């Protein structure tokens, strides 16, 4: 049995309305009895039980033991260590795992939108770019929206560790040049810890 502790969604920690969770999952269970134990050590305080309820989403033969942990926004954003102590009737000893946010002083991202390259206009679908750089930690959230509606046709490159110790990434929206020609205004919305309201967006037009 190998244990994998996972962090909460970047959006989930930034907006007070969402519930950020910490996930403790396991793969490859030993053949014997499923006697498992969990000791969630939250850097001092301890919940122990939490909500370890493995909702066995059985498909074919797969089904793992997941253990989510409701996290208090600030506690995660302040560098608390969330440890998961997984055990089982088969493992020689209990395997522990610990997660926290990327330790370091936060830096506010700078967002710049870039219109389609004049060479791309020769094509039917021009692409709008959004440069988000100089931020830290990496945990960020970028979305695109036109007229107050999310645009699903866009991809975002993972954070690249720049020379300055900070991070940077690019989000590319793909829109029909017909729409771009109409002078529509698109917006690059970015959410990040060190931003004024954990939110900021930049528009593009013709």
């Amino acid at each position, epitope marked *: 049995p190998s244990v994998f502790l996972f962090p909460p969604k970047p959006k989930d920690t930034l907006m*007070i309305s969402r519930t950020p969770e910490v996930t403790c999952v396991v793969v490859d269970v030993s053949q014997e009895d499923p006697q498992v134990q969990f000791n969630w050590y939250v850097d001092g305080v301890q919940v122990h039980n939490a909500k370890t309820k493995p909702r066995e989403q059985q498909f074919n033969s797969t089904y793992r033991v997941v253990s989510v942990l409701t996290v208090l926004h600030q506690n995660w954003l302040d560098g608390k260590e969330y440890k998961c102590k997984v055990s089982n009737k088969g493992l020689p000893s209990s395997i522990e795992k610990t997660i926290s946010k990327a330790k370091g002083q936060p830096r506010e991202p700078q967002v710049y939108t870039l219109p389609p390259s004049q060479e791309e206009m020769t094509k039917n679908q021009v692409s709008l770019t959004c440069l988000v750089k100089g931020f830290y930690p990496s945990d960020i959230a970028v979305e695109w929206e036109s*007229n107050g509606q999310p645009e699903n046709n866009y991809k975002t490159t993972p954070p690249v560790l720049d020379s300055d110790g900070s991070f940077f990434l690019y989000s590319r929206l793909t829109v029909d040049k017909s729409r771009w020609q109409e002078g529509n205004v698109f917006s690059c919305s970015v959410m990040h810890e060190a931003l004024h*309201n954990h939110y900021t967006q930049k528009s593009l037009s013709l």
Partner: antibody, heavy 123, light 108 residues
Framework: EVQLVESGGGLVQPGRSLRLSCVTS????????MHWVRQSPGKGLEWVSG????????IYADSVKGRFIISRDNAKNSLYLQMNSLRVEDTALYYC????????????????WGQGILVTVSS | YVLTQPPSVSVAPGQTARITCGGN??????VHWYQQKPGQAPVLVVY???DRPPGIPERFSGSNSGNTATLTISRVEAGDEADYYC???????????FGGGTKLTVLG
């Protein structure tokens, strides 16, 4: 596209009551604190009340405290305003508003406004 | 809290209309601006001091520091004729205070 549609009532005799409603569309209601802002027929806007996403934090205007009762229903994407103990001074166009804040204590700004329903209080 | 903005402001087309929103230590708060056209619900033209919502024209600039917040409209046009309100959330008492409103009369 985001649209806030209000209903409520209209003309009413002082002392009587009215329950306003605001059904929202175009965004996740659960994520935003809704507010009611009225506009006195002829001069300026006046903030009336507001309620957090989880209903946890309810707040009212001093010139409304005790009378009006603001409510919300995430499951139904609806915002209400139980106007109890009406008064002629309350005659105004009531607007529904959507804020846009994620930080614990934000300086609210009304991102989206409804067309505004009218309540007339008189004998 | 108290906000104070001039009743009216008359500027001929082309000129820049600067609407002043007075406030005691308003620089510690983030002013917001709304545009209310006759018989139309107000619209957010500027928020958090200088930010503009998608679609609002570039000529709409926000300013705020010390005891004054100044909405500036470059190349004022007839379509910009309406009432402008400066709002601010008073953190000290949980109340949203709006200014009296200013009438941008594009001179004709």
């Amino acid at each position: 596209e985001v649209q806030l549609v209000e209903s409520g009532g209209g003309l009413v005799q002082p002392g009587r009551s009215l329950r306003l409603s605001c059904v929202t569309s175009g965004f996740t209601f659960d994520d935003y604190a809704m507010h009611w802002v009225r506009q006195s027929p002829g001069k300026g806007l006046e903030w009336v009340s507001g309620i957090s996403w989880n209903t946890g934090t309810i707040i009212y205007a001093d010139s409304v405290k005790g009378r009006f009762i603001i409510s919300r229903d995430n499951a139904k994407n609806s915002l209400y305003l139980q106007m109890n103990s009406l008064r002629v001074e309350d005659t105004a166009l009531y607007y529904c508003a959507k804020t846009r804040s994620y930080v614990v204590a934000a300086e609210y700004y009304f991102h989206y406004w409804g067309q505004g329903i009218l309540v007339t209080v008189s004998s | 809290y108290v906000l104070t903005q001039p009743p009216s402001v008359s500027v001929a087309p082309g000129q820049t209309a600067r609407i002043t929103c007075g406030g005691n230590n308003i620089g510690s708060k983030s002013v917001h601006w709304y545009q209310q056209k006759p018989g139309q619900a107000p619209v957010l033209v500027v928020y958090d001091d200088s930010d503009r919502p998608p679609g609002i024209p570039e000529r709409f600039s926000g300013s705020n520091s010390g005891n004054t917040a100044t909405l500036t409209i470059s190349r004022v046009e007839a379509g910009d004729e309406a009432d402008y309100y400066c709002q601010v959330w008073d953190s000290s008492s949980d109340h949203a205070v709006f200014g009296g409103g200013t009438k941008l009369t594009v001179l004709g």
